[PDB]
Amino acid sequence: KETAAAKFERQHMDSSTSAASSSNYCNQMMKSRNLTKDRCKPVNTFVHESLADVQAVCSQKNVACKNGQTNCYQSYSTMSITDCRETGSSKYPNCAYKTTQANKHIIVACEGNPYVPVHFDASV
Template identity: 50%
Template sequence: MALKSLVLFSLLVLVLLVLEGAQPSLAQDFQRKHMDTSNGPFGRTYCNQMMRRRNLLRRTFNTFVHASLAAVQAVCREPNIRCRNGQNNCHRSRNQMSITDCILTRRRPSPNYRTINRRASIIIACVGNPPVPVHFDGSR
């Protein structure tokens, strides 16, 4: 029985270590996909350049948030709301932020994206302690 408990405890520790190690990479992935601290508004070619630069050309839609990382991380402290996938770890920004939506308009011969600059509240999913953004769920 003691051996079984030791094995289960070891597996639990291993899972926790893997999850802890995954959190920074998820946060870094969010930053790569959705953060751009430069100020807009941006011209017609912004999305084409950013989607190529960030290696996001397989995506048909993407949103870049133009705010500091601290401002976006602060959204994680807002009350929880339900995400589109049914999870309850999303948060909506209290204030509107500058964002740019990139919408794929043509895939071939080379991808072309429409650039739409606007202000909106962002909705992000956060995990960890302290919580960090890991998924952009939408905007309103």
């Protein structure tokens, strides 16, 4: 039902603000985006840039993906991101996360027409 483009936006896009202020962002947004439903998703990044700016990475630096495919793209610019990483103590269904704000290049896998991000590969 959900398109891979729509899944990418649900898991990785939080355009709203350009920051992460609250130490509690990740506990709230991992819940909000259905990433704690059946299990605690251990690691997830949110991108705090406009959808147009993230969709434009698909015409920037072509690189290999971690899986060896060559439809990955590295943002020319650093972006506002939040890294959500499960704490050592976290136990479903009380999923717990540390929030880390950063500015880093993103690497996304692009596919389809329109040619848009379908996978978050890494930040660098």
